[PDB]
Amino acid sequence: GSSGSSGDKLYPCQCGKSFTHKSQRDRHMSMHLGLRPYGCGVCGKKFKMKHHLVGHMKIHTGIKPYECNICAKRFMWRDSFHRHVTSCTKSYEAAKAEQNTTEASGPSSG
Template structure:
């Protein structure tokens, strides 16, 4: 693993993964919501958050028809 974290020493096989990990130490949140200003460390978290503002619910239960903004909420619902 050629990409070590300079803070904790954890090693990564990809530079991008190490860069994302470093944000956790540095408190960097480069992805900002245009609607409310909330900030995120990862793009996909911002995308999920934006569904709060848009009302989009792309995940649908095939049993009851319930709709969810986040896939993890559908998975939890299915259990």
């Protein structure tokens, strides 16, 4: 074994994403197509009728007392609310550059 080389095998999807397996990429392709006019943008469900969806949406319904500051996202749970916001800011701070002047970079003479 002197040496070896290789890349990475994956499976592209209609949307553009790439999965490790074909079955994982396929399921994402069939879902893309239009199945029902009503779709639950909370869990990932769907219903033919509008009333058929409501009887299910009642499982997600609920006021969001906790909301982010950067993305202003809404979260019903506390642990998740803070758990997310905590990071959501981490990055924001980096950009804040409250007192971080962007000084040009050093060139290269070769």
